[PDB]
Structure formats: C-alpha cells, structure tokens
Amino acid sequence: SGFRKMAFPSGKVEGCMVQVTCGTTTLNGLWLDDVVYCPRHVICTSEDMLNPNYEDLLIRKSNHNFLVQAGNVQLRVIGHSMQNCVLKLKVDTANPKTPKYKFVRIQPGQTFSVLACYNGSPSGVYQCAMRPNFTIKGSFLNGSCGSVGFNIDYDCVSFCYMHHMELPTGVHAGTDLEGNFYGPFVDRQTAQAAGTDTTITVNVLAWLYAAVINGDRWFLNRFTTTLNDFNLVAMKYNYEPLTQDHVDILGPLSAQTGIAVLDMCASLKELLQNGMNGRTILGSALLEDEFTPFDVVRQCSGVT
Amino acid sequence: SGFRKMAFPSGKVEGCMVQVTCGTTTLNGLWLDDVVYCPRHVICTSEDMLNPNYEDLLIRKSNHNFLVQAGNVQLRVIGHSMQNCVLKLKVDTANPKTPKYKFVRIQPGQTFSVLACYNGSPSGVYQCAMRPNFTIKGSFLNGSCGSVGFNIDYDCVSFCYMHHMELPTGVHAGTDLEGNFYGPFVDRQTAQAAGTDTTITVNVLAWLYAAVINGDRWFLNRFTTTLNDFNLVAMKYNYEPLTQDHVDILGPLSAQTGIAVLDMCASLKELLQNGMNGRTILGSALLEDEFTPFDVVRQCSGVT
Numbered sequence: 001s002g003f004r005k006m007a008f009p010s011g012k013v014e015g016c017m018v019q020v021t022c023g024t025t026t027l028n029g030l031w032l033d034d035v036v037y038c039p040r041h042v043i044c045t046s047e048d049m050l051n052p053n054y055e056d057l058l059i060r061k062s063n064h065n066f067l068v069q070a071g072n073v074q075l076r077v078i079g080h081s082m083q084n085c086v087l088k089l090k091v092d093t094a095n096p097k098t099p100k101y102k103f104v105r106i107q108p109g110q111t112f113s114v115l116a117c118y119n120g121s122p123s124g125v126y127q128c129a130m131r132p133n134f135t136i137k138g139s140f141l142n143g144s145c146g147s148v149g150f151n152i153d154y155d156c157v158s159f160c161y162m163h164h165m166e167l168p169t170g171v172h173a174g175t176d177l178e179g180n181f182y183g184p185f186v187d188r189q190t191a192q193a194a195g196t197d198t199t200i201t202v203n204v205l206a207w208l209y210a211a212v213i214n215g216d217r218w219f220l221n222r223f224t225t226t227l228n229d230f231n232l233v234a235m236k237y238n239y240e241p242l243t244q245d246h247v248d249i250l251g252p253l254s255a256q257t258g259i260a261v262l263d264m265c266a267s268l269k270e271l272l273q274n275g276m277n278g279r280t281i282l283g284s285a286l287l288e289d290e291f292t293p294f295d296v297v298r299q300c301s302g303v304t
Numbered sequence: 305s306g307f308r309k310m311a312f313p314s315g316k317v318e319g320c321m322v323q324v325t326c327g328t329t330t331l332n333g334l335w336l337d338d339v340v341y342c343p344r345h346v347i348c349t350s351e352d353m354l355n356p357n358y359e360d361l362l363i364r365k366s367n368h369n370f371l372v373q374a375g376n377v378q379l380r381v382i383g384h385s386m387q388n389c390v391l392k393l394k395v396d397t398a399n400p401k402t403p404k405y406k407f408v409r410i411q412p413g414q415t416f417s418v419l420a421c422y423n424g425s426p427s428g429v430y431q432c433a434m435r436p437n438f439t440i441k442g443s444f445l446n447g448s449c450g451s452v453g454f455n456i457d458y459d460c461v462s463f464c465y466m467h468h469m470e471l472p473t474g475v476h477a478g479t480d481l482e483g484n485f486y487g488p489f490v491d492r493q494t495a496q497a498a499g500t501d502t503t504i505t506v507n508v509l510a511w512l513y514a515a516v517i518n519g520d521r522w523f524l525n526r527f528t529t530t531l532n533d534f535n536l537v538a539m540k541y542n543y544e545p546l547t548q549d550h551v552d553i554l555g556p557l558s559a560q561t562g563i564a565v566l567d568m569c570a571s572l573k574e575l576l577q578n579g580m581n582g583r584t585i586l587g588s589a590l591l592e593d594e595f596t597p598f599d600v601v602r603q604c605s606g607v608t
C-alpha cells in the first residue's frame with residue numbers, strides 16, 4: 001500500500017539524451033537511430049525570438065553549424081530538416097542505446113513522465129499530465145528545451161512531448177515528436193493565452209478509487225448521483241464533464257472496490273460542495289487529478 | 305520556473321536490479337560488483353515471519369538455494385552471508401553496469417529517490433523522505449522488498465535505503481545497505497510502534513523559499529519572529545524544532561530571495577496558526593516537507 005506520484009524508470013530515455021548547440025544557443029536533443037530531434041528555436045538568438053522566420057533563419061545554417069554532443073563524443077551531422085517546430089539532425093551514427101520506440105500524440109488528461117535535462121545531461125524525473133488547456137505544469141529552467149515526456153509499455157518507449165517554451169504565466173508548452181505544439185501555442189516570444197485550466201474529473205475519480213484501495217475511506221458517503229446531476233456540480237467547479245466513456249474506463253476500479261462509479265461521483269460532489277474540512281486524502285489536502293485510471297491500476301498492481 | 309517532486313534519473317540503479325528467489329519467496333536484489341544485496345527475509349516463508357530465527361533458518365540454506373537472475377541470465381552464487389538484516393550473495397560475475405557507488409546512512413529529514421521493483425524489474429521512480437519517526441511513506445506492494453533508495457552526486461550513486469517491510473499502518477520500514485534498520489523496527493511480523501510523525505520544519509521553510517522563487521508570495525507577511533518564539537508554535541503543531549544549524553542551511557535560499565530566515569519563520573507561524581484559507585502554495589493546499597534546502601537549490605539551479 002501507499003500511493004505516490006510515480007514516474008517511469010528513465011534509463012531508456014537517459015541513453016537518448018544529447019546536447020545540441022547552434023551558434024550561441026544550447027539545448028537538449030533526443031537521439032533515436034541516426035536522427036537527433038530538437039526544438040527548432042535552437043537556431044534563434046534572444047533577438048530573433050520576438051518574430052522569427054524559421055525558414056529564413058534556417059537557410060543561413062548548414063550541417064556543420066549544429067554541434068551535437070553525446071556524452072563527451074561529437075556526432076557528425078550529415079543532414080538537417082525542419083518538421084513543424086522540430087529540427088531533425090541526421091547524424092552518421094545510429095544511437096547504440098536506441099530503445100524500442102513510438103511517437104504518439106497524447107490527449108489532454110493523459111499523464112507522462114518527464115526527464116528534465118540540461119546540456120544533454122539528465123537532472124531529474126517527474127510525473128505530470130497534459131492539462132485540458134494543453135499546457136503542462138512542469139519544472140523547467142533555461143536550457144531544459146528538448147527535454148522529453150514519455151510513457152513505457154514493458155520495453156517500448158512512447159515519446160509524447162518535447163519541451164519548447166515557458167509561457168509568461170510559468171506554465172509550459174511543447175510539441176509532440178513530429179513538432180506540432182500541444183494547444184494553440186507558437187514558438188514565439190509573444191503574448192500567448194493559455195486558457196482555463198480545468199480539473200480532469202476522470203483522474204480525480206481514479207485517485208478517489210486509489211484512496212479507498214489504500215484505506216482512506218472517510219469521504220465515502222451514503223449517496224449516489226446521475227451523470228447529468230454530477231456534471232451540473234462539476235461545471236460549477238471548472239471540472240471536465242464526465243462521460244459514459246469515463247464511467248467505462250473506471251470499470252476495473254469500480255469492480256475492485258465494489259463502489260459504483262456514480263456513488264464515487266456523489267462522494268466527489270460532496271467533497272466539492274463542502275470542502276475537505278482540514279482533512280487529507282492520500283496525504284493531500286486537495287483533489288489530485290494527475291493520475292489516470294490506467295496509472296492507478298498500474299501502481300496498485302505493480303506492472304514492470 | 306515550476307516546482308515538482310523530482311526524483312533522480314534511475315538508469316544507474318536500473319542496471320543493478322536483480323531478482324533473488326529462495327524457496328517460494330522472490331524479492332529484489334541490488335547487484336554491485338560481485339555481490340547481490342537483498343533483505344534477509346528472502347529465506348522465510350509466511351509461517352516463519354511470526355518469530356524467525358534467521359541464523360537457524362540460514363543454516364538450512366546453501367549457495368544453490370539462492371536463485372539470482374539478472375534480466376534473463378542466471379548468476380552463479382559462490383558465497384552467502386548475513387550482515388544484520390541483509391544477505392550478501394557473492395556471485396561469480398561482477399556487474400558490468402556497476403556505477404560509482406557509496407553506502408550511506410541518512411538522517412531523518414533527508415530525501416532520496418526510490419526505484420520500486422518487482423521480480424528484479426523496475427516499475428517506477430518516486431521521491432520521498434526519511435520521516436523523523438524513521439518510516440518512509442512509499443508506494444510498495446508485495447514483492448517490492450529489496451527495492452532501493454538512493455541519491456546521485458554527478459556520477460556517484462549513494463545507496464541509502466533498502467525496502468524490507470510494510471507496517472500494519474501502511475507506512476514502510478527498511479534498512480541502510482549494511483542491513484541496519486532505520487528506526488526501532490525489526491524484520492518480524494509483530495506489533496511495531498512507528499511513533500509520532502512530525503513535520504520536517506527546515507524542509508517546509510526550504511519549500512516556502514522555492515515558492516517565493518517561483519512567484520507564489522501571498523503568504524509573505526510584515527512580521528518577524530525569534531527561534532524560541534517560532535519553536536513554541538512549531539512544537540504545538542508537531543513540527544520539528546528549528547535550530548541555528550537549520551537557519552545556516554537555509555542561508556543560500558535566504559540570500560537568493562532577500563528574505564531573512566526568521567521572517568520566513570514568521571510567515572510559516574501565521575500559516576500554521578491561521579491555515580491556508582482555501583489557497584494553495586506551489587499547487588499544494590498543505591505545507592510540503594519532502595524537499596530539503598539542498599533539493600530546492602538543486603532544482604532551482606539545474607544540477608545534472
């Protein structure tokens with residue numbers, strides 16, 4: 001028992017991190033096979049960041065201007081190309097540590113691990129979620145660009161995020177591994193509107209099931225609700241609407257605990273309306289929404 | 305910016321995890337050089353767990369009864385010995401992936417990363433602290449024994465914890481890498497008193513400095529306090545007493561923010577006495593105490 005914000009083991013991803021330098025800018029790259037993926041803003045100086053024309057800026061750059069370093073060895077760049085907001089640097093050496101991998105574009109509400117890197121070296125690993133407003137609440141400093149987000153299925157790493165920006169609000173924006181930003185964000189130093197950060201209702205419910213599994217049952221009440229009644233309360237509290245797909249996804253957790261999804265919804269409804277009254281749930285004084293029903297099941301069953 | 309419960313990259317430790325089976329019991333082992341370290345309770349059946357005489361139980365075991373598997377290859381055990389509550393299995397092959405390492409016994413209040421494992425395979429990585437009552441609030445299921453806690457200094461892994469037990473209360477107990485339990489716990493299935501779980505005051509203060517660094521300044525007030533006045537409030541709220549050593553350890557954070565330690569103490573004092581009033585600090589509704597002043601500085605400076 002015990003429930004923790006748990007990240008995937010990062011070793012497979014550590015073996016892919018490299019440092020990419022272009023001119024005066026240094027950020028992280030992901031080395032998979034003979035290609036290094038990195039944010040295209042590696043070609044920009046701070047001056048260029050106001051209104052960059054990446055196509056025009058890229059024209060002034062040749063293969064030899066992209067300095068790629070893996071550990072302490074330099075990689076030879078034999079090709080370069082821009083795919084949306086990522087640069088793909090073709091190197092002459094395939095990464096001998098390339099794991100089995102996929103490039104996936106996740107949905108808002110899904111969770112993933114981030115290996116925060118600086119100068120191609122990993123500094124830490126943490127678990128986060130793609131928010132409904134397509135931002136992430138990471139922990140990133142200057143130089144962390146090119147740090148990636150991933151999920152692991154046994155031995156296959158599904159890369160889902162590459163870090164690009166910090167918005168003026170302190171939240172983070174980035175792309176999938178094809179260079180498409182999550183959300184309406186652009187790689188420009190301009191006023192960008194993040195949007196309402198709603199709570200991922202299905203994830204809160206999964207975490208309430210994790211609490212019951214782990215013995216915290218104080219919030220369980222004698223009431224039930226309907227999807228429509230629950231959603232009237234959920235909208236009022238900026239919670240994502242709960243759908244029948246979400247009820248179905250909570251099926252395994254509902255079965256394991258013997259608590260019907262709509263009964264857990266009524267518990268959540270009362271927690272929203274009355275607060276926690278100074279009490280905690282799994283050592284938290286707020287409702288946690290960065291665990292999916294899959295994360296809860298995985299953590300409570302010990303999938304390796 | 306952004307502040308997260310961040311763990312060390314686990315790759316160096318993943319390369320050391322093995323599965324140790326003795327009879328019907330399987331748990332994790334740590335393979336460093338030609339020695340596999342594991343909890344001595346690997347020799348016990350559930351029946352033996354009530355009152356085990358490990359010396360007598362060990363006599364019935366020979367090298368060939370300890371099945372050590374690294375990945376899918378079997379390691380040949382050429383020696384075995386008990387050191388306090390750990391078994392050290394001498395194998396004929398040195399781990400080719402042994403990183404630079406140390407065995408250290410941490411103090412209550414210090415933090416470390418845990419690589420949770422099952423059958424020698426890692427499932428997740430999370431950050432935790434050794435509580436003042438010498439328990440840890442981990443996330444561990446049956447089979448996780450032998451999972452380790454560690455810190456990394458550039459390339460040197462300092463192993464500090466090996467998981468052994470879950471107490472009836474759901475908290476976890478374990479040893480350092482010499483087999484000495486943290487706290488008064490014994491590897492026996494008996495009624496064991498964890499003790500008062502106090503709050504690590506110096507860590508709360510460090511996290512308050514991290515909040516100011518990251519822009520959350522609502523809790524900063526116009527007051528100051530003294531160590532003795534602060535401690536009168538701290539004892540009332542089961543907070544660890546704050547000493548001049550702790551004030552000194554917060555020096556760098558105090559300098560970076562321009563907020564004197566005793567002024568942050570007065571802020572903490574008012575947060576304790578008045579509560580958060582439904583507000584959050586770094587996305588938390590309670591005072592976080594699992595970040596040391598070193599963790600805060602490391603995260604805010606990007607040490608790799």
Ligand SMILES: O=C(Cc1cccc(Cl)n1)Nc1cncc2ccccc12
Pocket residue numbers: 041049140141142143144145164165166167186187188189305
């Ligand atoms: O945001 C940028 C650079 C940038 C500026 C404008 C547009 C684009 Cl695409 N990229 N880098 C950072 C990322 N994450 C965290 C940071 C923390 C401090 C300073 C920079 C940080």
Ligand SMILES: O=C(Cc1cccc(Cl)n1)Nc1cncc2ccccc12
Pocket residue numbers: 001345353444445446447448449468469470471490491492493
């Ligand atoms: O506590 C034990 C086995 C045990 C029993 C008595 C004494 C000793 Cl030294 N060891 N194993 C576990 C560790 N962590 C978490 C667990 C969760 C569920 C079931 C067992 C768990």
